[PDB]
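Thread: Modeling a multi-component assembly for a lab meeting

Hi all, long-time lurker, first post. My supervisor asked me to bring a structural picture of a complex we are working on to next week's group meeting, and I have zero experience with this. I have the sequence lines for every component (1527 residues in total). Could someone generate the structure of the whole assembly? Inputs are pasted exactly as I received them:
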Amino acid sequence: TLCLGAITTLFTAMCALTQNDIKKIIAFSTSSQLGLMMVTIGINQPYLAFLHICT
Amino acid sequence: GFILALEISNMTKNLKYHYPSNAFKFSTLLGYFPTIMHRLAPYMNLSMSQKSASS
Amino acid sequence: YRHSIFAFTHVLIPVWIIHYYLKYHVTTKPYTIVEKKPRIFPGDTILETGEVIPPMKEFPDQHH
Amino acid sequence: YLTHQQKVLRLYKRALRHLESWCIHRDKYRYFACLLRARFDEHKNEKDMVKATQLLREAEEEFWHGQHPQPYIFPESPGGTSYERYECYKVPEWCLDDWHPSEKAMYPDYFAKREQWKKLRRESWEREVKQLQEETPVGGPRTEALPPARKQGDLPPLWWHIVTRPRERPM
Amino acid sequence: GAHLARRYLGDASVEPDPLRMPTFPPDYGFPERKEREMVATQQEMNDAQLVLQQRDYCAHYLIRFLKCKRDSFPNFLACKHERHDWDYCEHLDYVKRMKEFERERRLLQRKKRREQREADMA
Amino acid sequence: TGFYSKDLIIEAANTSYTNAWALLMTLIATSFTAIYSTRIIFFALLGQPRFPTLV
Amino acid sequence: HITKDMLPGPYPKTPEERAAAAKKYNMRVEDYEPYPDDGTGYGDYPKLPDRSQQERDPWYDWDHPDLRLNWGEPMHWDLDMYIRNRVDTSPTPVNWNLMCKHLFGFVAFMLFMFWVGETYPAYQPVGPKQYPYNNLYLERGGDPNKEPEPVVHYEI
Amino acid sequence: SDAPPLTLEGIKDRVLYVLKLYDKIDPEKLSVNSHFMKDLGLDSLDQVEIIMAMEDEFGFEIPDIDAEKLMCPQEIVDYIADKKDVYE
Amino acid sequence: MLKYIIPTIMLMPLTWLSKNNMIWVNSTAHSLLISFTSLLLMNQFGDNSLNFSLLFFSDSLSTPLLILTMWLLPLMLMASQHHLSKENLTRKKLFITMLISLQLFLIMTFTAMELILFYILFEATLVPTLIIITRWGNQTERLNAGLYFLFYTLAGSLPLLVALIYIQNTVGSLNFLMLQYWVQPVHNSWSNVFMWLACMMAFMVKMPLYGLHLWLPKAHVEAPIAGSMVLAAVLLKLGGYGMLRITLILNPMTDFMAYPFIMLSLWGMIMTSSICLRQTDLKSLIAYSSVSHMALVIVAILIQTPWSYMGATALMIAHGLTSSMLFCLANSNYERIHSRTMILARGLQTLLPLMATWWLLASLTNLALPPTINLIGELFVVMSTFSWSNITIILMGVNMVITALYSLYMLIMTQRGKYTYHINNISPSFTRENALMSLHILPLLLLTLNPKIILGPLY
Amino acid sequence: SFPKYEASRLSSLPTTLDPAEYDISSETRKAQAERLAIRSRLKREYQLQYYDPSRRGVIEDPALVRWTYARSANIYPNFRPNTKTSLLGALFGIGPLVFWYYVFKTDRDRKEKLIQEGKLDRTFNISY
Amino acid sequence: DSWDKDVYPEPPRRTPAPSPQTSLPNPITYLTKAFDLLVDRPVTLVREFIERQHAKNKYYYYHREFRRVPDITECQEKDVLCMFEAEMQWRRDYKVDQEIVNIIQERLKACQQREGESHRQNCAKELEQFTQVVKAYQDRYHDLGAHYSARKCLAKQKQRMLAERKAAKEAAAA
Ligand SMILES: CCCCCCCCCCCC(=O)OC[C@H](COP(=O)(O)OCC[N+](C)(C)C)OC(=O)CCCCCCCCCCC
Ligand SMILES: *C(=O)CCCCCCCCCCCCC
Ligand SMILES: [Zn+2]
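Re: Modeling a multi-component assembly
Sure thing. I ran the full set together rather than chain by chain. Output:
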């Protein structure tokens, strides 16, 4: 889960560095943030992932 | 990252030319994942589904 | 008036049905509603039996 | 088939758009659009027809190598974000022949007016058929586009759907 | 981390393995090693329903803080003082588990000197 | 809102028995968050309006 | 109610047959290319180019705008696979070979680095954090009978 | 959509207002009926820029199969009118 | 069971003695009353079945298949009123007679306590089914469809006849209740291998099993609407009901004899689901969907676990309502455009707003959206096959992906997109058409609330 | 120069970068003009019926009928059992069936031993 | 009472007496007081009226008791009359056992929620009962198959006993 999230938080963010459509840019932002949550679950901090979900 | 964003952002204002690179096209087209998988797997699956499975 | 009706037909009526349903059909069967027992602490009195839990030992604490 | 004139004109249309996407800023677009405009002027006087083609096949190749990987698209064009976004609202017009009277009476003016067009088409159709068959080679039609109204009163043949196509923004 | 470079790019038998922390003999080496006291022995910890991991040593600090929260409600801004007390106790507990890192690290650089002294004695 | 969840994750991620490469991806991604976020602000709030006349 | 003279048929093996087949399918006799007579059952059905319907002039006035076909136009053997909701074959800005090399390379290196970063973790200097009562033996589901070997942690 | 419908008079006014900042067409000579090859003698490639100017003014982009056929500022109103269902 | 047999026979005099203009009204009304009375079969006990007499009995496996059967007859009469509109009265009353005679054989088949009585009525359904296909089919291929539907079934039914009689001479009785107490284990000898195949291949052909399915795309596609509804809703379940019974007397030989038929089903499940992705005929696409769905029933029956049997029963009932509904939806389009090509009429959601809602609800159940009984039955089979072999999750997961692809592809190629310009005769949905769909889906959705009545004898 | 575009079945050759449109041959123009003839003759037939107000129903499209007929009904009478068809059928039909048999058969034999011996964990397994 | 307390045991509750420290009020207490005024009391009246009507015409439904019958082990071979009653009783006992397991599972899940974070220690006897009964349940009813019956259950039992006795017999020879 750590590695799966780590690549996702990077690859999708990289795709957002050159994207034009506003919704696409915010779409890839969600994917990167979702990857950040997966990293949290991969380090044994489930409540921080939940905390990041609500915020 | 913020500073590099503005500094790179202002560089676009300069009247210099641009060189289409490989990383830029790699980031622009979502890393090519939604151009091979979304065009190869449908071709492999929908061609086998007709020439082999049915005909 | 619009909210008074809404708070009546959509909150007061449904909560009456649910409370009646929970209090006389759900809670009358075992383990349908299970409550996590409350967190008890030293220096408190139990409302049901009057038991008192002795406070913790002295704290070898410091300042800052 | 396109003409050698059109192909150059098309490649000019694309180049500015793809050029515009790279520049973003309007001021930098003018500074670079003119230079691209300038380069066409160099060979604009070319009259070889064998080296103009040679450059054109290198003009398209030059465009392709440097084309934008995500050109801007106007949001109603074949590739935009609202292309066919309203095709679900573009109901045909023949569907109103199936309406119930209880709801057709809701618009007494509209359907009384409709019968005029059906008459204007039912009576006009035979004339429209005659006009097309008499302006066509014996073998058969050779191209698109149709003759317009020749005399007075007659409407152009094959006009009903062109005129009555659903409004592009039904709702 | 910084000592990681000392164990991956540099020497190996100097840093102590995080999963092989001191297997050296018992407290022997430090005269009069004591035992860390526990305040909430067995039942106090298993009455506030503390998380399985939270009740390490500062359970009494945590229990005191959780007492304030249940009482200060709805004054959630309150109890800030008690939280700092519990945090500070864990800060000391963190350094204590951090001393054992350097403690064993130096006990390794000392153990190699005797190993190298005997190796080069001849 | 976001600091109370996002930042707490990085602190826990950096100070955990984690995967070195995965940790680096998370930090690099966080920098990428500022770059594309600045892309939205710069290209839609600052500069001169590129939008059409009658709007 | 179409007779067996306007429907597909066997492979054409003479010049005269190919002409009639082209007329049957509404094609220019020079542009009519039967599928190879390999015995897989294609018959005399024209082998149209394997071009997606997305590769058609979106501005031309089609009889079927959604499908981009003209009434009476012979239909590709795989028209249902080349509709706009399915396999697309439009030219790409980057050649197909180049795209696969870059995508494969990115995924290959990323996985290798995760493996490298797995056998070389990145932790902080700490110890085996201590817990009381024989390492929470009674709290961690341990059997009250058969008490464990005394585990005790000292100050430092 | 909250966008006021385009009026027939509005389109034509906008068309000329576009063909009055070109610096290549005489403001006093161009009218609703003004060719680009037979009356005021404009460059063929200038039509492309003129067409591009209209598209950036109205949003929708004209195809490069009938845009070429439009060299008559009024005809640009004719085409734009029969692309937004403007009847008055 | 006479309380349901005699009313069913009396529908034939009703049709023939009714007014020339009231044949549809009377038959539809009284057939609905028979369906209503079938709810009394649910008096089921937890230890013993409901044993009526020496001939007939009804347990929790037969009861759901009986109620679906008697409920399907009214719906077949509504669906047939259109294309049997220019038909002369005598032939219209013969068409209804065949439908009634088919129900009569079906309810007796599902309650026959004797396995030779089961066989006779099992085969008796072929005669009216063949007559419906060949006499009231629209195409020239209906004549060839009947031959395929007839000789595929008889090629496997006749060996079953010999095997059943051989069992009686050995055990002494083919009464099902007796077999539950006198069943003996089957030894592993070549003679018993062919006794196993003879007792099973008669039902594999009707399920149908992959490989032995070529009759279904020909029979379900050329048959009239009423024929297709019964063909895919009940007559396929005749094979499933047969295995659930006759597998009692085939243990322990079913442990290894089932391997060839689990690979045909598990793999053939993927193949037929894939075929639906490229079908050019809407009716043919639905026919291949039945093959994919019935592949699960074969697997569940052949692994013989309490969860597999519970899933199989719910799957058979769930598929019966869904498959019949899809054929009815596809026929409403045909009654207007008079063409089975799927790509001929598109964007129908713009012309028939309500019929598109039925398409969505039909498609969702087809792809097993929870908590519909379509998912409950499929889920239980997946749970049981996982314990049978953990690797099967790969095959039954891939099938889920393909099932969603061709079900929503069917919903997108006809209802969404751009309406066909040259089709101008798409009239609004008749009350008959709308009510026909509501009767398929409402009971299908209602069974979710109380699904234990379709979970079979092992609930 | 630049790397010339290289085509593939999933990425066709762009019309612009194609040495087939620029050349203007005598046979090409009399051909490309001939294709637009039939392409317009058929449109005339459809255009007439599409507009005829005295017409309700569906315009039968012979091209559509021919397409579906060849996809379903004309395949078998044009099939010859040869090296390609036989080998393709054998490895597409029997291949997967035989492969999955040994995958499952091997697994179930493996599980059976661990259960007969007692070396498999079935402590809480009572639903099957 | 509604449900027997010896079947679904629940430890006696212990609600800690409130000991507020803050001067601010507790809105939960007000909502609690408001709830049992606009909801509980109006609802309690309706049940009491409905309760009175049910008391006017009380009628009783009894719990069916099944007389014991000879088990399959006492039935002659191919004696359907004796086998039938033996099989029916076995199926009834099978359904009762399927619900005994549900009772212990229900108790096990009840304990886990009640004890919160302390379930891994406080809920230890519930798991022990659950593990024992499932072992007993698995021994009698498992691997029988869809066509289970008393005969197959008996044969499985006689297989287990033979394995034990052979192990027990050869245990003494170790
Ligand atoms: C502490 C951790 C490090 C912190 C700093 C972050 C890393 C440094 C890079 C940030 C700057 C940046 O990627 O810039 C982003 C720029 C911005 O668009 P532009 O091209 O300038 O303008 C666009 C308009 N044009 C072209 C007309 C001028 O896009 C690029 O260059 C395109 C490629 C971006 C991804 C390249 C990195 C991915 C490598 C992995 C394999 C693909
Ligand atoms: C211990 O595990 C340290 C892990 C931290 C990794 C991020 C390193 C970033 C260093 C950037 C250079 C800053 C120098 C001041
Ligand atoms: Zn009809």
